[PDB]
Design a binder for this molecule. Structure first.
Ligand SMILES: O=C(O)c1cc(-c2ccc(OCc3ccccc3)cc2)nc2c1cnn2Cc1ccncc1
Ligand SMILES: [Ca+2]
Ligand SMILES: [Ca+2]
Ligand SMILES: [Ca+2]
Ligand SMILES: [Ca+2]
Length: 433
């Protein structure tokens, strides 16, 4: 009955973030609840041939939540989920939020080695995966867990075998009996994000802090009920989930449109079919798109905004976005640990093409420091340190590492090398180990 442990913000900071209206002390399910109230029949998710309305998304995740609760999974428990880019990812995410189960969403590209490390760290009582994934092709991996007393009490499979619990069965049919359930408290852990060498580290995220980042990002990117966002990056990634990502689009009442990956021809036909107007990519994928865009100009005309974040995205490449992809560019530099930066939609061309923008919050605090951790002269290159209303205060159960990446004032040192431009934005220039 003990809630998952995590490092808290100081009480003084928590109060300030409430006073400012950042933390409103609602669960992440707020997004769905409110949507169902306002526009139950608007499309929330488009996936292949399927069209899920807000109320359907709400019903289905409720069904699964009741099933999990009926089996005694709830507050204090954790879950490991590994699903590809399909509507079930969101159904499951909202079900676990509803049920009070703290969930770690593994990347679909993760393998037995990562999965094992995650299971060891969070002792999930629930595992959801897909039979089509390499790790669950056979029962080797699953059986291995019994050999080590880490077997989950419940295992659900997408593309299940006859003797499996079918994920779709637990979604489609509500439970026999009724057991009470509810989200974890808003200033407590909702789910684990993952850092992006060694296995990824677990980043506890509370409803308060995640919802804030989501609502504020949605406003910054001008999302609204007509937004149709392509989800071609991995759904669990902070960028694709919250920046502003699927949660942002749902917050704004719009629709998420799934793609398996950023392969251009498939993405282009999806964009044409559903008149997608927003997408989010990393530079290597922007380059793939640029290679075909001229020829498939007609298919992607509806794009109005493309976010680009990740690796190097030099100016000469950035300028090709409006020129070739025929949509506005927004640069994004963020981290699953918290801090996200966006170029604003009304920024100058220079800002948009040569910087990675500025923080979500007026209360995102930034230090740029030299080798002695003294703030460098304004405009010079330095190591990034940050804290704010949606930046974490430590990795899960990692006191040693935490002490090595936070300073006495609880600034987080992300290892990024950056400089502030005169205009006020940030330029990412490298990384330090
Ligand atoms: O500094 C970075 O290394 C970085 C990587 C990625 C990123 C990398 C891979 C992703 O998915 C990996 C993938 C790419 C192409 C096809 C299939 C999978 C998603 C985001 N996104 C980044 C980075 C820096 N800002 N952003 C945007 C961002 C926004 C919010 N939270 C975290 C990151
Ligand atoms: Ca439907
Ligand atoms: Ca366009
Ligand atoms: Ca053009
Ligand atoms: Ca980093």
């Amino acid at each position: 009955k003990q809630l998952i442990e995590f490092v808290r913000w100081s009480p003084e900071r928590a109060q300030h973030y409430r006073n400012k209206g950042y933390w409103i002390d609602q669960p992440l399910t707020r997004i769905l609840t409110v949507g169902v109230q306002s526009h139950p029949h608007s499309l929330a998710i488009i996936c292949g041939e399927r069209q899920l309305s807000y109320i359907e998304l709400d019903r289905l995740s409720t069904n699964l939540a009741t099933r999990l609760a009926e089996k005694g999974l709830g507050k204090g428990d954790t879950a490991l989920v590994q699903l590809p880019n399909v509507a079930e990812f969101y159904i499951v995410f909202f079900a676990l939020l509803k049920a009070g189960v703290v969930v770690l969403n593994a990347l679909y590209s993760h393998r037995q080695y990562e999965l094992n490390a995650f299971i060891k760290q969070i002792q999930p009582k629930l595992l959801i995966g897909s039979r089509q994934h390499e790790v669950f092709s056979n029962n080797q991996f699953i059986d291995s867990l019994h050999d080590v007393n880490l077997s989950p009490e419940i295992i659900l499979m997408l593309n299940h075998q006859a003797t499996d619990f079918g994920l779709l069965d637990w979604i489609e049919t509500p439970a026999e009996t009724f057991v009470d359930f509810s989200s974890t408290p808003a200033d407590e852990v909702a789910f684990f994000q993952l850092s992006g060498t060694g296995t990824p580290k677990l980043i506890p995220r509370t409803h308060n802090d995640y919802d804030y980042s989501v609502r504020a990002s949605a406003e910054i990117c001008g999302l609204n009920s007509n937004t149709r966002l392509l989800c071609a990056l991995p759904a669990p990634h902070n960028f694709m989930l919250s920046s502003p990502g699927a949660l942002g689009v749902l917050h704004a009442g719009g629709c998420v449109v799934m793609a398996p990956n950023p392969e251009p021809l498939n993405c282009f036909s999806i964009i044409q079919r559903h008149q997608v107007n927003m997408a989010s990519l990393v530079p290597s994928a922007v380059i793939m798109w640029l290679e075909k865009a001229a020829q498939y100009k007609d298919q992607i005309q509806s794009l109005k905004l493309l976010q680009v974040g990740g690796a190097s995205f030099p100016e000469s490449l950035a300028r090709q976005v409006p020129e070739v992809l025929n949509c506005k560019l927004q640069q994004v530099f963020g981290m699953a640990e918290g801090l996200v930066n966006y170029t604003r939609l009304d920024d100058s061309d220079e800002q948009i093409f040569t910087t990675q923008g500025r923080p979500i919050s007026s209360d995102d605090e930034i230090k740029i420091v030299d080798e002695q951790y003294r703030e460098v002269p304004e405009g010079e290159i330095g190591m990034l340190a940050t804290r704010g209303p949606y930046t974490f205060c430590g990795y899960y159960q990692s006191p040693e590492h935490n002490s090595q990446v936070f300073d006495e004032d609880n600034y987080y040192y992300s290892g990024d090398l950056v400089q502030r431009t005169p205009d006020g934005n940030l330029r990412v220039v490298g990384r330090i180990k």
